[PDB]
Design a protein around this nucleic acid. Structure first.
Ligand SMILES: [Mg+2]
Ligand SMILES: [Zn+2]
Lengths: 1337, 82, 49, 81, 50, 148
DNA sequence: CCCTGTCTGGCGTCCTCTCACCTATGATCATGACG
DNA sequence: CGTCATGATCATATTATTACGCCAGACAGGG
């Protein structure tokens, strides 16, 4: 009926009795004389109801005026057989029985309820030990587990008032005698008083369980089954195999085993058990119930035939092939069909061909309704026989029902949301689905046997949704970016590339024409060749006036094909969109400018007319590939012979003993790379400019009209590499190690390949195919986890009302600027209003959507960093406001209130997962001002500027404000320049040593040794073959404890014996040393800046995106500074070396055991700041969250995943990754519980505690403060306040047991629970319906 | 019928378009009301969106007409009784 | 299979992605007309009545 | 357990002369029991047992309305409860 | 009889089908010349020569 | 050798004949490649894959249509298609795509009467397979319900 | 009690199409033939 | 007429391991 919540809890035995209509007592199922079932076994009649409707087993009631009375013979209430789908029965277990889901779910709820480890509970529940209940005034405890000899002791000495039992009765007495109030008070008092971190974490988990168990209405003894339900008999059906036998389902086998074992246990408790004997049978019963509830969780599973374990109940709820993923989230659907697709280019792009037979079988009841509405059949049966005979009138009926009625076409791997589209059918004689060609760019569908499925929208609202929302003309922009998805693919760009070019002398040269009309009349009559340059007169409409079109006319020096194309271009566009070669990118931005000028309807009709004339002139072209089209260079053989002479030189140098093996291998692969590039350059000249033709003067060369060159240059199919493999050598292939074979394949596909070269090509090809297979296997699961972590986020307000957004700057790796400001700050609402550097002059107001005119006005003034409002920094409780998202991608305006952006975001990220892969100084280029960031620099004796910092970042500020170069500058690097200066291009301004860590100084003075005792702290290692020896400074490991607590230090002094202080501060100047230091300059030498005091020795694919969103920690975390101030050392080598951070204003006693295998960065006399590193390597995301903020971790995630998606050449806009990062960091942890009802270590979701302290703090109270934690997407989706989402995702057993003992109460909360329960999604039209429903609450 | 662009130009939500056009098509199909634009034997969905494009139907006018033609029915009942 | 006269040219879009366009001269000569055989079984079982 | 349950010298002596009751069993074919049918045209319902044959048949309790007609059947013929 | 699509050749690098096409046309050219030398009822000497 | 064998017949050396057009009757520019290719018919025919279903038989344990072609069945509106309809704003299309057209038996008989009488309207109800989920979770020790 | 190793639980693409396979062995009872 | 042998029909659960891999979180080993 109507309901707003699905409550889950434990079930008392009175509840199982009150569900049940009878009791199963025998294990027989069918009689197999007839198929009338046996009373009262599994399949019954007096427990579960009649087999046939109103058909009483005995038979005595079958009147329409005699309903309600039950039978007397068989006592079967003559009702309906649907009631055998809903009546349940119960089994009375002769002895109680432990449920397996609360015993072995890891963690064990019976385990950390009783304060008892799982091994003792398993040794009690399987009748092989003794646990104590009611220990009495004896030596024995309560939870003390015993054995056989100890129970003999305790029954000899204390056969009186002492007691102890075993099995499920003992666990039931333990759980029943548990007093929850005493345990709550005792655990609160202990966590007030004990205060040990292992005990703290363990006891706060146990008190979380006890408060969630006391606040609900459960009882602890309900976790031990006394009465066990049976599933209704329609849901465990007994299929015939049409051979006289019933291969039964696994459930009836399991229930039959439980009832056999239970009846034998009732009979053995009846006729008395032989003392220590009534135990094996109860063990067997417990193990049979544990086989029924979850088979295979206990040790070795059972089987019927032969190796495969049979199916329990938990194998019907969990995983694939279960009720959540196979029957409830994706269903089999009536009014649907499927066939093989094909082309048919005579279609408009809102219509598809569909067969007469499929259109007659999908649309049957529509035809029945029109027949009995026009009066051509009296009843429904005459109409059915008419449309079975297919008489001559029903085709007119079918053309009158198709006419304005969309269908849904669907390709079988739906990757993104353009995979389901809606068309208006056209009846086809034939048996295939004719599908418009341009549309097949979105399906990723060729026509080599692909199959698509059509669905019919029955109701009226679904026809309107398949016309207004899902029609093929509406989705012309992708939701991943702003690129059009109606890009003309292969034949039509060859037709347009052949249509508009020019050759220097053809038919009809230089004549003048009175418009494009007689240009077409000249080409169609053979009086003028298609690409021959010609002056024509064009009249183009440019919309300079205010929405009114201004007609200008001119004389363009153009060709004939450009005029014939110009008869198709709409009014508003300029002429210089068709006055070029028109490859694929030119025609794609042609459609882009037609969309962003003239709107939508001319873009649809202009895409259709482009496809028509492209197919027509590709037909007239005849661009045929032959064997004389691939011109072999005449210099291929001489280049191969030069490279082979060079490998002969390297060979007869190698056997003279001058080169090693690796140096030989590198030189050989370099000369083969050089020969391959010379062959590629020679064939590319001999393709692109070989054709020479006389201009009617002497001679001239042009761009070639070779067939394979146009097919590679237009952009239809191929690139430089593939036409390089068809004419030049196809290069060096790899081996299965991943290494690379030193003798390359010097033969192309136009010539032959002998046997070994083809075998090496096979190495490469099969490696690629196996990559694609396992690549798809990971990519689909990535899309699943992302749409199940987002799943719920609906644009639910219209303005949040905050200011704090993220800062968008163009990304700078250290070369060219990869992603500019226009392509990042396109269409997103500004955070703080941008002021031009004419300060106190506003350029944009602070709530302006930055569309294309505003982005050009940003590019003109060279705006530094447009601070902009992101989804991750929003304020809307339970959803995301509309202004912080941005433009509706795939459309033009702002996002509508309602469109589910989590699902389109997760599809846009996971959809290019098929394309991804699986397995010294600073050199400047440009010129400008020089910027330094986070640098502590000083002046050397040479006059330069030397650095005393690892955190130095060099920047190149250009002439107008932004930055075009950025360089991470190492520790102790030496600059040839300074800050704010001016350099030139090609000038290396910095140099260092990547092998040596320089320990350069600040003040100028003598060098002495402090706490440096020879023999222990420093050792005497004379450099034997050079001479310049050093007192080698050792580590903490080699010297013993006599010098382990003494650190060697180099104190830069003066001649007086004092310390020359730091300029500015009265702190002394000394440098402490760690181990592995090679000190060159000894006691008694004056130094200056820039001199080393010592020498110190030192996956990017689809799994990288996986490891980003899973938020795994790396194996070598770059550790950061916890708190600021000075830093020092601690306890010496308990495996690791400690680190003690002492601030100025903070507190000192914090320590951290750094492994000394990592190369550190900081010394004793360096001040740190929180958020700054201590060592190097990959940087963990949790550390970014707890140390730097929230904006830092969303910026780090979007940069680190956009580097992958831009390395593989994929455009994805950044809103989608920002909103997945919003759905990651959703939980929070409490620090101070305050005046609310939280804990000190509770992990509650963020919006809950934000509305909680928003309603505390709004009145005269004090709120509750928080701290955020970041969850990986599978843990962020399993940790929800809604158990149906976390059950439709991964493991169902753990989610349902936690929600069962907690009494958790879902309220259908978003999209997927409403997809489960069968009602409207709260995203589109159902969002308006849900606002109405919630307003009427 | 090919595009529904102006039907969104006059009802800016693109989801309220579906509710208003479904309400209108349910009034034209089963309730037996005449279309306010002359058809060309189009189905009731396209006639609904064709009335949206003329501007003579949206949710405001539909609530006005349902309140007035409910008050008319109850007024006819009251004048028949008294 | 059988050997037929083929030409490599774009012909008015009907061979767009990978499609093939075949003259009626091929189907008139009955030269791809394959012959299939289906086996349909019917058993006379033994039930009640 | 790995080895058989530690059987002490008590139950063995207690099971040196057991079965001191009577027929008892699982309440199947006795003097005043219930038994469902499985074969014949008088099957589908239940019945009762009394004095059976022995090495041939048994005693079925067939009855509809207020009358009853006995029909000796072997227990294989019927369905022993 | 059949009109294929040329654009499948430079991307899907199966250049062997074009050599198979040219050699098949050579084979049918020899077959047409045999059919011409036999349809005109020529004696076995010219057939032996060709 | 291919060139020398194409020279024995009187065919052109490059293998390419100029070809006229059938429709227009005028010559294709830039002469095209003809020849003989040995082509195979594969047994993935089209009148073995094509299938359509208005209303057929229904499965027994979960009241959803059967699967396959020999069993007269309907195509699986899988999970990613449900995601792709959540990704639009299509809400009534998905509601009838998983309540009326698929599972709810009283809903689909009301739908069939309403379609043959011209009234395009759905009475939604509940999926019967969700009641199967309730019976399978309820057949454990778990007490799942429906509040209010 | 504070690490650090082991252990055992989770998970590993979609849609469709085809085909086979879904006991046999042993014991008891009854009937027929031979002595 | 009785006994023995052969054939037909009906009746229940080892019969007497090895070639995935990662992550993760709890349980416990060592110190
Ligand atoms: Mg394909
Ligand atoms: Zn916001």
């Amino acid at each position: 009926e109507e309901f707003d919540a699905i409550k889950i809890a434990l079930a008392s035995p009175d509840m199982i009795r009150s569900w049940s209509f009878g009791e199963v007592k025998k294990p027989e199922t069918i009689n197999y004389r007839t198929f009338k079932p046996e009373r009262d076994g599994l399949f019954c009649a007096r427990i579960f109801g009649p087999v046939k409707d109103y058909e009483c087993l005995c038979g005595k009631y079958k009147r329409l005026k005699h309903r309600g009375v039950i039978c007397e013979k068989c006592g079967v209430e003559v009702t309906q057989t649907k009631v055998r789908r809903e009546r349940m029965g119960h089994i009375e277990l002769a002895s109680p029985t432990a449920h397996i889901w609360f015993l072995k779910s890891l963690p064990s709820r019976i385990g950390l309820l009783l304060d008892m480890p799982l091994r003792d509970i398993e040794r009690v529940l399987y009748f092989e030990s003794y646990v104590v209940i009611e220990g009495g005034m004896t030596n024995l405890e309560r939870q003390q587990i015993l054995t056989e000899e100890q129970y003999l002791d305790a029954l000899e000495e204390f056969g009186d008032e002492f007691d102890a039992k075993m099995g499920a009765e003992a666990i039931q007495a333990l759980l029943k005698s548990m007093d929850l109030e005493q345990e709550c008070e005792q655990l609160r008092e202990e966590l007030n008083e004990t205060n040990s971190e292992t005990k703290r974490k363990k006891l706060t988990k146990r008190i979380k369980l006890l408060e969630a168990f006391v606040q609900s209405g459960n009882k602890p003894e309900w976790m031990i089954l006394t009465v066990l339900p049976v599933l209704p008999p329609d849901l465990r059906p007994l299929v015939p195999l049409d051979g006289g036998r019933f291969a039964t389902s696994d459930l009836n086998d399991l229930y039959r085993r439980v009832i056999n074992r239970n009846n034998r246990l009732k009979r053995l408790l009846d006729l008395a058990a032989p003392d220590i004997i009534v135990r094996n049978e109860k063990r067997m019963l417990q193990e049979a119930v544990d086989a029924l509830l979850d088979n295979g969780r206990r040790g070795r599973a059972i089987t019927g035939s032969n190796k495969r374990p049979l199916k329990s109940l938990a194998d019907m709820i969990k995983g694939k092939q279960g009720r959540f993923r196979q029957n409830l989230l994706g269903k089999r659907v009536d009014y649907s069909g499927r066939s093989v697709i094909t082309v048919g280019p005579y279609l408009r792009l809102h219509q598809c061909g569909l067969p007469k037979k499929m259109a007659l079988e999908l649309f049957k009841p529509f035809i029945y309704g029109k027949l009995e509405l026009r009066g051509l059949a009296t009843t429904i049966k005459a109409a059915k026989k008419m449309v079975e005979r297919e008489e001559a009138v029903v085709w007119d009926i079918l053309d009158e029902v198709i006419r304005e009625h969309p269908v849904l076409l669907n390709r079988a791997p739906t990757l993104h949301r353009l995979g389901i589209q809606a068309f208006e059918p056209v009846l086809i004689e034939g048996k295939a689905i004719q599908l418009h060609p341009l549309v097949c760019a979105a399906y990723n569908a060729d026509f080599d046997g692909d199959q698509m499925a059509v669905h019919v929208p029955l109701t009226l609202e679904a026809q309107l949704e398949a016309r207004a929302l899902m029609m093929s003309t509406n989705n012309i922009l992708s939701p991943a970016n702003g690129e059009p998805i109606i890009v003309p693919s292969q034949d039509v760009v060859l037709g347009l590339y052949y249509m508009t070019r020019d050759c220097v002398n053809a038919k009809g040269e230089g004549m003048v024409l009175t418009g494009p009309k007689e240009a077409e009349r000249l080409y169609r009559s053979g009086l003028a060749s298609l690409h021959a340059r010609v002056k024509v007169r064009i009249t183009e409409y440019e919309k300079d006036a205010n929405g009114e079109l201004v007609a200008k006319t001119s004389l363009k020096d153009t060709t004939v094909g450009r005029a014939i194309l110009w008869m198709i271009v709409p009014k508003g566009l300029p002429y210089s969109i068709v006055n070029q070669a028109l490859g694929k990118k030119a025609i794609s931005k042609m459609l882009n400018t037609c969309y962003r000028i003239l709107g939508l309807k001319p873009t649809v009709i202009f895409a259709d007319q482009i496809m028509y004339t492209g197919f027509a002139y590709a037909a007239r072209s005849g661009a045929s590939v032959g064997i004389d089209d691939m011109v072999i260079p005449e210099k291929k053989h001489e280049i191969i012979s030069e490279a082979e002479a060079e490998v002969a030189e390297i060979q007869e140098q190698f056997q003279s003993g001058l080169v090693t093996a690796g140096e030989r291998y590198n030189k050989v692969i370099d000369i083969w790379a050089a020969a391959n590039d010379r062959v590629s350059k020679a064939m590319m000249d001999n393709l692109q400019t070989e054709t020479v033709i006389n201009r009617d003067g002497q001679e001239e060369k042009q761009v070639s009209f070779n067939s394979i060159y146009m097919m590679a240059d237009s952009g239809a199919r191929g690139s430089a590499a593939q036409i390089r493999q068809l004419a030049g050598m196809r290069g060096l292939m790899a081996k299965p190690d991943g290494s690379i074979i030193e003798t390359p394949i010097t033969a192309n596909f136009r010539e032959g390949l002998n046997v070994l070269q083809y075998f090496i090509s096979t190495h490469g090809a099969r490696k690629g195919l196996a990559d694609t297979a396992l690549k798809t296997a990971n990519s689909g699961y990535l899309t699943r986890r992302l749409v199940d972590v987002a799943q719920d986020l609906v644009v639910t307000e219209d303005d949040c009302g905050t200011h704090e957004g993220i800062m968008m700057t163009p990304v700078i790796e250290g070369g060219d600027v990869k992603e500019p400001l226009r392509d990042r700050v396109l269409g997103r609402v500004t955070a703080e209003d941008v002021l031009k550097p004419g300060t106190a002059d506003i350029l944009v107001p602070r709530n302006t959507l930055l569309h294309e005119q505003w982005c050009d006005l940003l590019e003109e003034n060279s705006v530094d960093a447009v601070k902009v409002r992101s989804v991750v920094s929003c304020d809307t409780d339970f959803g995301v406001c509309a202004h912080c998202y941005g433009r509706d991608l795939a459309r033009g305006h702002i996002i509508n209130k309602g469109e589910a952006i989590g699902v389109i975001a997760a599809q846009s990220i996971g959809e290019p997962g098929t394309q991804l892969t699986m397995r010294s100084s600073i050199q400047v280029k440009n010129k400008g001002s020089i910027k330094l960031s986070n640098v502590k620099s000083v002046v050397n004796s040479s006059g330069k500027l030397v650095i005393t910092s690892r955190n130095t970042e060099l920047k190149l500020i250009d002439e107008f404000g932004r930055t075009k170069e950025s360089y991470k500058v190492p520790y102790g690097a030496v600059l040839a320049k300074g800050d704010g200066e001016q350099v030139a291009g090609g000038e290396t301004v910095a140099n260092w040593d990547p092998h040596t860590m320089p320990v350069i100084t600040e003040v100028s003075g003598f060098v002495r040794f402090t706490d440096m005792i020879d023999g222990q702290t420093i050792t005497r290692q004379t450099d034997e073959l050079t001479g310049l020896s050093s007192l080698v400074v050792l580590d903490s490991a080699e010297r013993t404890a006599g010098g382990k607590d003494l650190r060697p230090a180099l104190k830069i002094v003066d001649a007086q014996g004092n310390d020359v202080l730091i300029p500015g501060t009265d702190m002394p100047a000394q440098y402490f040393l760690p181990g592995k230091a090679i000190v060159q300059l000894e006691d008694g030498v004056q130094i200056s800046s820039g001199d080393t005091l010592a020498r110190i020795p030192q996956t990017g694919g689809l799994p990288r995106v996986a490891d980003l969103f899973e938020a795994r920690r790396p194996k070598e975390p770059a550790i950061l500074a916890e708190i600021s101030g000075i830093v020092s050392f601690g306890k010496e080598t308990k495996g690791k070396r400690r680190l003690v951070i002492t601030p100025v204003d903070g507190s000192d006693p914090y320590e951290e055991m750094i492994p000394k295998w990592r190369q550190l960065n900081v010394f004793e006399g360096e001040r740190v700041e929180r958020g700054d590193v201590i060592s190097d390597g990959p940087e963990a995301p949790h550390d970014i969250l707890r140390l730097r903020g929230v904006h830092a971790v969303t910026r780090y995630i979007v940069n680190e995943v956009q580097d992958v998606y831009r390395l593989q050449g994929v455009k994805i806009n950044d809103k989608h990754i920002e909103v997945i990062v919003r759905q990651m960091l959703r939980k929070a942890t409490i620090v101070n519980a305050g005046s609310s009802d939280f804990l000190e270590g509770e992990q509650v979701e963020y919006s809950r505690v934000k509305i909680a302290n928003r309603e505390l703090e709004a009145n005269g109270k004090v709120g509750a403060t928080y701290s955020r934690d970041l969850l990986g997407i599978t843990k962020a989706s399993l940790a929800t306040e809604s158990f149906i989402s976390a059950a439709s995702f991964q493991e169902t057993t753990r989610v349902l047991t936690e929600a069962a003992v907690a009494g958790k109460r879902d309220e259908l909360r978003g999209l997927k629970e409403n997809v489960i329960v069968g009602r409207l999604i709260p995203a589109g039209t159902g969002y308006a319906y849900h606002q109405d429903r919630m307003r009427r609450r | 019928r090919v595009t529904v662009q102006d039907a969104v130009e006059k009802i800016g939500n693109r989801f309220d378009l579906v509710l208003v056009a479904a309400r209108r098509a349910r009034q034209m199909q089963v309730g037996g009301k005449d279309p306010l634009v002359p058809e060309e034997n189009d189905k009731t969905t396209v006639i609904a969106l064709r009335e949206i494009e003329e501007g003579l139907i949206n949710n405001q006018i539909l609530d006005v007409r349902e309140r007035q033609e409910q008050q008319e029915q109850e007024a006819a009942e009251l004048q028949a009784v008294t | 299979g059988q050997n037929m006269r083929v030409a490599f040219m774009p012909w008015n879009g009907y061979n767009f992605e990978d499609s093939i366009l075949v003259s009626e001269r091929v189907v008139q000569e009955d030269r791809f007309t394959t012959i299939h055989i289906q086996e349909l079984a019917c058993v006379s079982r033994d039930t009640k009545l | 357990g790995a080895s058989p349950a530690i059987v002490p010298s008590a139950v063995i002596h207690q099971l040196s002369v057991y079965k001191p009751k009577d027929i008892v069993d699982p309440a199947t074919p006795y003097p005043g029991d219930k038994v469902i049918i499985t074969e014949g045209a008088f099957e589908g319902f239940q019945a009762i047992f009394t004095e059976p044959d022995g090495e041939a048949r048994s005693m079925l309790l067939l009855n509809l309305i207020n009358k009853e007609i006995k029909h000796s059947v072997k227990n294989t013929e019927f369905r022993k409860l | 009889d059949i009109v294929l699509n040329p654009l499948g050749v430079p991307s899907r690098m199966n250049i062997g089908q074009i050599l198979e096409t040219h050699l098949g046309m050579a084979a049918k050219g020899i077959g047409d010349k045999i059919n011409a030398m036999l349809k005109q009822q020529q004696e076995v000497a010219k057939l032996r020569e060709f | 050798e291919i060139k020398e064998l194409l020279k024995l017949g009187d065919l052109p050396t490059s293998g390419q004949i100029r070809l006229y057009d059938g429709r227009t009757g005028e010559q294709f520019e830039r002469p095209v490649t003809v020849g003989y290719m040995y082509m195979l018919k594969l047994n993935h025919l089209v009148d073995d894959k094509m299938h359509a279903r208005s209303t057929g038989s229904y499965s027994l344990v979960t009241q959803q249509p059967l699967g396959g072609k020999a069993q007269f069945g309907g195509q699986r509106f899988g999970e990613m298609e449900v995601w792709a309809l959540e990704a639009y704003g299509a809400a009534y299309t998905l509601q009838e795509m998983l309540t009326v057209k698929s599972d709810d038996v009283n809903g689909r008989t009301k739908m069939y009467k309403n379609i043959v009488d011209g009234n395009h309207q759905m009475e939604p109800g509940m999926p019967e397979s969700f009641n199967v989920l309730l019976k399978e979770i309820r057949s454990l020790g778990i007490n799942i319900e429906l509040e209010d």
